[PDB]
Amino acid sequence: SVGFGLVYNSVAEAKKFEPTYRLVRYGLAEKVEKASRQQRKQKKNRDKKIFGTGKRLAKKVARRNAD
Amino acid sequence: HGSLARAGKVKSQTPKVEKTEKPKKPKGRAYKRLLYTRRFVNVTLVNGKRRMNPGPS
Amino acid sequence: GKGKPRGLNSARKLRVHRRNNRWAENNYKKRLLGTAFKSSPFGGSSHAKGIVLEKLGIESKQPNSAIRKCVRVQLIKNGKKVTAFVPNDGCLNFVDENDEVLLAGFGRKGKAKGDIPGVRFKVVKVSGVSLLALWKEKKEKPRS
Amino acid sequence: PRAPRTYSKTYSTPKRPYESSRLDAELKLAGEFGLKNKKEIYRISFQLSKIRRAARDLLTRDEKDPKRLFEGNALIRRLVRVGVLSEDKKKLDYVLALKVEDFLERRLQTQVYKLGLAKSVHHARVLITQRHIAVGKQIVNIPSFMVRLDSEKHIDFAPTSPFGGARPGRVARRNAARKAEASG
RNA sequence: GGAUAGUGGCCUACCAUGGUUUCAACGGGUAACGGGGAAUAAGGGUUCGAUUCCGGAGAGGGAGCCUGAGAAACGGCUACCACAUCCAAGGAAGGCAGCAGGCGCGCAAAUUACCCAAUCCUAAUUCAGGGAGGUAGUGACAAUAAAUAACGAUACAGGGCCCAUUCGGGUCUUGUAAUUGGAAUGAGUACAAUGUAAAUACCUUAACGAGGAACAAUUGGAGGGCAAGUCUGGUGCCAGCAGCCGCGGUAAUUCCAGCUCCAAUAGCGUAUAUUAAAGUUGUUGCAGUUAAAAAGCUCGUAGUUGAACUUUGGGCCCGGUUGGCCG
Incomplete structure (x- = not known):
């Protein structure tokens, strides 16, 4: 079997030059938990649908629900 | 003339028969070897025209 | 010259x-x-779907004596009435009426094939099943 | 978007489909070289016709034509390398007049059949398809391989191969246990 | 002169009557986006090219426009015209000819999967974003290699050559005639190792998978072209076959059932279009007396074509080229 096998100078340089997929496959980093792309884009759409933080929106929702 | 019927008369009235029992014959490579052995190296029937599937007589 | x-x-x-x-x-x-x-x-087109209307017992030209049990079919895209041959045995009994037929040419780029007049198309399916598989009983005509 | 992947056909079928002479010639060639289908003979005929077309479009020009030296030399070298041309006949008229028998005589299946490790070309192709041949340091499962003349000397049982040792065999021990069970 | 980033009937005013055309203008058709290309394999050619690349164009139909360097932009607006949820009968918001998916048309095709891992682009610029892209499922439009297994024993009928005491034997398997056992293999077991994003896709495994009513191969045909049945049973102007000729008024080598088969053979049959066949579009290269075709006859313009003749041929000198004063 022949494959791309390579070495770095040190572990810190390895971490600074390798992306997280290689890091998690080599145990150099922890597998961070990410949401599905559809849901992340859905929330990217929702926070664009609403303008700003939405505190005034929550206040208005409470005012309307009080009716 | 008014014959929109009687379709498949022979299909109806011939007896339904199944093939006689026989083990599956060789297929493919073994089949072509049997063809070679019965066609080239067989001197059995080269009488006048070297028949291929001579009917019984 | x-x-x-x-x-x-x-x-x-x-x-x-x-x-x-x-x-x-x-x-x-x-x-x-x-x-x-x-x-x-x-x-x-290479093919066309059809809805069969009725049966025709048009006879065969000389020297011959038989009928060729064709069907009258209304086309779906063109709205044209044609007379299509159903080749196999009992196929008239299988496309008696109103069935969903699939139709193709007959092999002579728009000419009658044998001793059958005025027929230039033949069926290759009925509502999804092939005529010869129906003939060999490998499949059964869907009533539903 | 993507660059298309180029494919090509390897066999051109004969125009006249059914003639006794050609049909019997190809059948006898396939049977006596231990082939299963006509795809092999059709593909090699297609290649041979391609080579003959090249040779004709080559010899249609005069000697010492610059493209002629290049292409004729490369074709001749490829032919002697594959082994169709005998070691001392580089004339290129025989390159035009090659034989499909000349091509298939070198075929690896017939090579192992001549070497006799299978006692029969049927068993020979069975071996090739079963991978009990390490052509070099790697095992080849194709009867059509156009060898490079070192595998001929290097033919042996692979380290992960039966009939050679270092392994008893799962079937061998299964039958040994079965014999033990039959005895007791 | 205006307008444009610019020239210009691009548009306005004035002036003259010009511009194209039988060398096909103008018009109609285009089941017409163009090219690089694909299919024939004598040459010449014929047909298509929506479509992996380039140049256009459009975002439902035209029209208008802001912003922006760059849009007449549509996942930007402004209206009209047909599509198009609710009403809390005030009114609001749009064009999937981007990706999956639905309905129609259907002859014409893919599941409402996953991610920026491998290619680029966008930005205030390493990092952030991308149904652009890449990775799976279905899928026989297509192309490669190549599974549906093969062994070895006479279960006697002379090939290299013999014993030379007429099949008495042949040491080999052929020159099979219905008894046939392995040392071994593949798809899939992927607990694991290669491998990407966590699984699958090539290579291995301590362990399973063949002794074949298991893992069992289809399509067209046996009259011809185009080899493959006077082999059986059934029907007997009737069911059919039959791409074309043809088959059957109780005996069908063509119809229905089987066996043998012949061809391709995980391939094959069928329908339409197209190429060669087609020297049946003929430039190469066809035919016109009787087979289709020489206009009834002549004139004649465009077109096509059109006699011969104008420096010919002798001299000298060399770089260098092919058996060739020479091995």
Whole structure:
């Protein structure tokens, strides 16, 4: 079997030059938990649908629900 | 003339028969070897025209 | 001699004459006129679906004695009534009426095949099942 | 978007489909070289016709034509390398007049059949398809391989191969246990 | 002169009557986006090219426009025209000819999967974003290699050559005639190792998978072209076959059932279009007395074509080229 096998100078340089997929496959980093792309884009759409933080929106929702 | 019927008369009235029992014959490579052995190296029937599937007589 | 012009500057004459006389070819004329798009029941298509209407017991031409049990079919895209042959045995009994048939040509680019007049198409399916698989009982006609 | 992947056909079928002479010639060639289908003979005929077309389009020009030296030399070298041309006949008229028998005589299946490790070309192709041949340091499962003349000397049992040792065999021990069970 | 970033009937005013055309203008058709290309394999050619690349164009139909360097932009607006949820009968918001998916048309095709891992682009610029892209499912439009297994024993009928005491034997398997056992293999077991994003896709495994009513191969045909049945049973102008000729008035080598088969053979049959066949479009290269075709005859313009003749041929000198004063 022949494959791309390579070495770095040190572990810190390895971490600074390798992306997280290689890091998690080599145990150099922890597998961070990410949401599905559809849901992340859905929330990217929702926070664009609403303008700003939405505190005034929550206040208005409470005012309307009080009716 | 008014014959929109009687379709498949022979299909109806011939007896339904199944093939006689026989083990599956060789297929493919073994089949072509049997063809070679019965066609080239067989001197059995080269009488006048070297028949291929001579009917019984 | 030999008719046609031979001059080095006669190319336009040769080309125009070839066009005029190429018009005399049967398939060239049909292909450029688009008779398959304006006059053909199939509209230049390889196949067409159909709804069978009734049965015809048109007899066979001489020297022969038989009927060829065709079906009258209304097309779906063209709205045209055609007479299509159903090849196999009992196929009339299988497409008695109102079934969903699939129709193709007959093998002679729009001519009657044998001793059957006025039929130029034949069926290759009935509502999803093939006529010969139906004939060999590998599959069964869907009543639903 | 993507660049298309180029494919090509390897066999051109004969125009006249059914003639006794050609049909019997190809059948006898396939049977006596231990082939299963006509795809092999059709593909090699297609290649041979391609080579003959190249040779004709080559010899249609005069000697010492610059493209002629290049292409004729490369074709001749490829032919002697594959082994169709004998070691001392580089004339290129025989390159035009090659034989499909000349091509298939070198075929690896017939090579192992001549070497006799299978006692029969049927068993020979069975071995090739079963991978009990390490052509070099790697095992080849194709009867059509156009060898490079070192595998001929290097033919042996692979380290992960039966009939050679270092392994008893799962079937061998299964039958040994079965014999033990039959005895007791 | 205006307008444009610019020239210009691009548009306005004035002036003259010009511009194209039988060398096909103008018009109609285009089941017409163009090219690089694909299919023939004598040459010449014929047909298509929506579509992996380039140049256009459009975002439902035209029209208008802001912003922006760059849009007449549509996942930007302004209206009209047909599509198009609710009403809390005030009114609001749009064009999937981007990706999956639905309905129609259907002859014409893919599941409402996953991610920026491998290619680029966008930005204030390493990092952030991308149904652009890449990775799976279905899928026989297509192309490669190549599974549906093969062994070895006479269960006697002379090939290299013999014993030379007429099949008495042949040491080999052929020159099979219905008894046939392995040392071994593949798809899939992927607990694991290669491998990407966590699984699958090539290579291995301590362990399973063949002794074949298991893992069992289809399509067209046996009259011809185009080899493959006077082999059987059934029907007997009737069911059919039959791409074309043809088959059957109780005996069908063609119809229905089987066996043998012949061809391709995980391939094959069928329908339409197209190429060669087609020297049945003929430039190469066809025919016109009787087979289709020489206009009834002549004139004649465009077109095509059109006699011969104008420096010919002798001299000298060399770089260098092919058996060739020479091995």
